[PDB]
Design a protein around this ligand. Structure first.
Ligand SMILES: O=C1O[C@H](c2ccc(OCc3cccc4ccccc34)cc2)C(c2ccccc2)=C1O
Lengths: 228, 257
């Protein structure tokens, strides 16, 4: 069985690379030369306008995530409504996962890494804008201390999408069966890639709690308008 | 065959199951025995309406009883937690922090053991109160137990028995991502050991059960949600029912949760 699992993991990893331009390996190299937004004069040279821009980029993400999901073995063979339902409820969770790749404790890469917007400047935004990104920063510092890389996140992202508990699925069985196989593939992946990281698998799963917590909290704070 | 590492995880499993039996007078095993007619001596009285309530013996009188059941559950969980190796060795402040946030998640975990899709065991298993009688209570008391039922039916589908739950509720208590924790690292190393012990336990007790470990852990999402929903509904109760008194042990657990 362990053969197909490695083959599943590599399959997911290649697809992840093709679907997501800005990988985690790339983002970290940059964070360790982008234009820095630390202030208002800084931003101009680069409140409502900032929050709408996160919206624009979030919409582009969903298309990337959607393309990635269709590479997940068995995903397209699912009931079409079930596919739509899985992406509908899954993309927020995936966006925050992947946003963590672009953050450190001091700020976030924007514009596919061409910029960097400081955590402090974000906080300085008047209410309720100045509070939308602080909880994601809190989650990212926790998340990134796991030091996953892109081949780990490729499987992780796939497991999130194949969640058999989205509201209103029609045929939960093949979803959980795929998720079952993805979890097996994640577990072996973490074991070979992090032999020293004890029970990394378990601590990763526990972050879905956190992730879902962020997503519900974000929702609450929340023609062109047609597009969003 | 099993090695010295496995053998230490097995002994921690045995020790926690043992303490669990000593701390919780109504186990799942007994609850299931009562709910499924393995009884001629253990069958419960069934409350499904006002006269059946009257016969065993409103929406506040029920609520005051579930809330003082909760208090003596906190005590049982508190007794069980002291038995988790390393728990009492941690900073006293963290000990209370771990209890403050963990108690509710464990209470609804264990409450599931007393539930089927149709109702819930009460008064140590002597009684059984139907899901319908509860959902029929005046607002917002009718909204009280429905999320718990919905959790339980999914959670009960995992078919965990008590030796599993003992380790799982120990993983819950020893949660290093709790608000305000002084020393997270000693907490994580205990939970890391619990997680190893749960992982082996699930694989030995449920070998035909693919990825039960992962599926069990993902249920922590559902508990956190039950807790959140419960707090909100308690917020509403305090405004509409200012003559209703909540219990101090429980006051302290909700302050800034
Ligand atoms: O212009 C912008 O870019 C920014 C940005 C927004 C979301 C974002 O999410 C990261 C991300 C989310 C989902 C899928 C991805 C796939 C590949 C790489 C990153 C992916 C990344 C950059 C961004 C922005 C604005 C406000 C707060 C945070 C970021 C812009 O104003």
């Amino acid at each position: 069985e362990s053969a197909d699992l490695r083959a599943l993991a590599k399959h997911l990893y290649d697809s992840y690379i093709k679907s997501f331009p800005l990988t985690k390996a790339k983002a970290r190299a940059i964070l360790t030369s982008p234009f820095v937004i630390y202030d208002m004069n800084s931003l101009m040279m680069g409140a409502i306008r900032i929050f709408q821009g996160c919206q624009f980029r979030s919409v582009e993400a969903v298309q990337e995530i959607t393309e990635y999901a269709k590479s997940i073995p068995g995903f397209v063979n699912l009931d079409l409504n079930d596919q739509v339902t899985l992406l509908k409820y899954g993309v927020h969770e995936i966006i925050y996962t992947m946003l963590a790749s672009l953050m450190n404790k001091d700020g976030v890469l924007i514009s596919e890494g061409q910029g960097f917007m400081t955590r402090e400047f974000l906080k300085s935004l008047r209410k309720p804008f100045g509070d939308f990104m602080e909880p994601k920063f809190e989650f990212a510092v926790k998340f990134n201390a796991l030091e996953l890389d892109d081949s780990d996140l490729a499987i992780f992202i796939a497991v999130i999408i194949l969640s058999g508990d989205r509201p209103g699925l029609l045929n939960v069985k093949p979803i959980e069966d795929i998720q079952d196989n993805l979890l097996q593939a994640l577990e072996l992946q973490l074991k070979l890639n992090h032999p020293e990281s004890s029970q990394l698998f378990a601590k990763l799963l526990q972050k879905m709690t956190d992730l879902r917590q962020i997503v519900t909290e974000h929702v609450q704070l929340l023609l062109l308008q047609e597009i969003y």
